[PDB]
From a paper:
Although structurally very similar to ubiquitin, the highly conserved protein [name] does not function as a covalent modifier but binds proteins only non-covalently. [name] of yeast and mammalian cells associates with the spliceosome through interaction with the tri-snRNP protein Snu66. Comprising solely the ubiquitin-fold and lacking N- or C-terminal extensions, [name] is only able to function through non-covalent interactions with other proteins. Importantly, [name] does not seem to influence splicing of all splice substrates equally, but to facilitate only certain splicing events of particular introns/exons of pre-mRNAs. These findings thus lead to the model that the ubiquitin-like protein [name] plays a conserved role in the spliceosome as modulator of splicing activity.
To characterize the [name]–HIND interaction further, we obtained structural information of human [name] in complex with a peptide corresponding to the single human HIND sequence. The interaction between [name] and the α-helical HIND peptide is mediated through a salt bridge formed by D22 of [name] and R127 of HIND, strengthened by hydrophobic contacts involving aliphatic fragments of residues of [name]’s HIND and the [name] interface. Although [name] possesses an ubiquitin fold, it uses the opposite protein surface for Snu66 binding compared to ubiquitin for binding to ubiquitin receptors like Rad23. In contrast, the [name]–HIND interaction surface is located on the opposite side to the canonical UBD patch formed by helix α1 and sheets β1β2. The X-ray analysis revealed that human and S. cerevisiae [name]-HIND complexes have overall very similar, superimposable structures with a root mean squared deviation (RMSD) of 0.716 Å. The two structures only show small differences, particularly in protein loops extending opposite of the [name]–HIND interaction surface. Because RS domains can mediate protein–protein interactions as well, we mapped the [name]-binding site using [name] truncations and found that the single HIND motif of [name] is sufficient and necessary for [name] binding. Testing the relevance of the salt bridge between D22 of [name] and R127 of the HIND element for this interaction, we found that a recombinant fusion protein of GFP with the N-terminal domain of [name] (aa 1–139), but not a similar fragment bearing an alanine replacement of a the R127 residue (R127A) in its HIND domain, bound endogenous [name] of human cell extracts in GFP-immunoprecipitation assays. Conversely, only immunoprecipitation of stably expressed GFP-fusions of wild-type (WT) [name] but not of a [name] variant harboring an alanine replacement of the D22 residue (D22A) co-isolated endogenous [name] from human cell lysates. From these findings we infer that binding of human [name] to Snu66 does indeed depended on the integrity of this salt bridge, showing that physical properties of [name] are highly conserved at the molecular level.
Numbering used by the authors:
A (entry chain A): -2 to 73
B (entry chain C): 0 to 18
Amino acid sequence: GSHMIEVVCNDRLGKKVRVKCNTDDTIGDLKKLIAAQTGTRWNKIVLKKWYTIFKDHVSLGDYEIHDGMNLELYYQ
Amino acid sequence: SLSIEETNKLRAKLGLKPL
């Protein structure tokens, strides 16, 4: 970090967006990127992976998000 | 997916720093 990575976000119907981001971005910031790139609103997005619900104010780096990582995208 | 430069312009628009 700062270090550019990409993340893949898949929703339950199989729609996929791959987002370029930086390890210092927050989860809330990624969600803003996701939102813009999928026609939705950042505050209606939930990001998970298995048992982890990502908190908005934590950076990707502190969540140890790796390059290429697949995240689960949900709507609220 | 968006290029680095297209991502950077979007980032700029959202108040985020460059990649």
